[PDB]
Structures are given as C-alpha cells and as structure tokens.
Amino acid sequence: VLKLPIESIHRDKDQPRTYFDEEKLKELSESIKAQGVLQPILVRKDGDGYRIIAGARRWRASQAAGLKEVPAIVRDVTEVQAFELALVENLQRADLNPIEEAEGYKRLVDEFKLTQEQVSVRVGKERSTVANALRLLALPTDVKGMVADGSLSMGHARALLGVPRLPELQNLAKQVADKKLSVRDTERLVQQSR
C-alpha cells in the first residue's frame, strides 16, 4: 500500500457517480480527520499521475481535510475492467441496519466509556444522529425488530417514542408497519395517545 501525493491523483471522467451529497462528504472528511483513510483508494497510471478507479469521495474528503497523501493501490487494468471495479466496489456492500448502528454507539458508550460527544467525533456523525440512534434502543423488542428489518423507518420510530403506555406503543407500531402508514400520519396518532 502506497501513500500517493494527493496532487498526483485526478478524477475519472467516465466515473459512474455524478452527485456528491455535501453533508455526507463533510461527515466522511470528519471520520478521516479522526481515523485516517481506512481503505486505500484504487487508481491506475494516467497522464502525469493517477486517475481514480474507485475512491472519489475519499479523495475529495481527504483534500477537504488538508491531507498531503492518500493510501492507494495502483491497479494495472483496462478501461473496461476499471469501470467494472468501480461498480463492484460501490454495489457489493451491505449496510448496518439502524439497530446495529445504534448498538454500535451503545457499546462505545457502555463498554468503552466514551461520551456521546466522543462517539460523534471518533466516528464522524452528528450529535443528533448519535443521540437519536441511542433513544431507539428504549423501544420494546418487537418494535426494534421492525426497525431492524426495515418495516419501520427511523422517522417512524422517533415518533413512537412519544407514546406513554408500552402496551399502546406496541399496538400502534404494529398498525403503522402493517398499514404502511407515512411518518406524518404516525405523528398525529401518537398525540392522541397522550
């Protein structure tokens, strides 16, 4: 694994990704300041330096963070194979579900004795994201199960935390998931439970 001078790397004009969410890029950059770039970018020799195969976000985020080098693997590949590698890198991934994410933050706090502030800084996420994820874990087992398997979104879950009675919360959760009610619909029903 090389450390390539950041100035020697330029973008792939044939890149599959067009839009770069600004906030997500900033979060990536914060994680880089905390941990460095964990996974080397893939590049190929091109012109006066290297062109990205896979790693445009790591590259841009490293630039924003003011790094002088980025870890890199130099691949000797054709143009068609470079494009296949870019797609494979992006598409062959499975995200943690919201409960797995929440439990991750909880382990850093409970087992490793980090504050929520430190979690936020060390992983590169907003304080609200960390706080909200942690509040999900107060929900009953069946409801967390619905958040985990994606039958309830994070939005749905945030609303349901306002139901005072645990029996009633669980019944409402089932209804929202079963009828596939929108997040706004769910908010209204919680206020009635009061």
Applying CB under 8 A, the residues found at the interface with its own copies are: 1, 14, 16-21, 24, 27-28, 31, 34-35, 38-40, 42, 54, 57, 73, 79-80, 83-97, 100-101, 103-104, 107-108, 112, 114, 122-125, 148, 180, 182
Give the chain's largest Cα–Cα span.
66
Report residue 54: phi and psi, to 5°.
-145, 125
The residue length of the chain stands at: 194
Q: Which is nearer to its own copies, 125 or 193 (CB)?
A: 125
What percent of the chain is helix, strand and coil (3-state, nearest 5)? 55, 10, 30
Q: Work out which of 9, 53, 58, 67 binds ligand CDP, going by CB under 6 A.
A: 58
194 binds, among ligand CDP, its own copies, Mg ion, none (CB under 5 to 8 A by kind): none
**Which of these ranges, 28-36, 103-111, 130-138, 146-154, lies near ligand CDP under the rule CB under 6 A?**
28-36
Choose, by CB under 6 A, the member of 90, 171, 182, 191 that binds ligand CDP: 90
Contacts of 156 (CB under 8 A, 6+ apart): 147, 173, 176, 177, 183, 186
Residue 37 binds: one of Mg ion, its own copies, ligand CDP, none (C-beta under 5 to 8 A by kind): ligand CDP
User: How many other β-carbons are positioned within 10 Å of the β-carbon of residue 192?
Assistant: 9
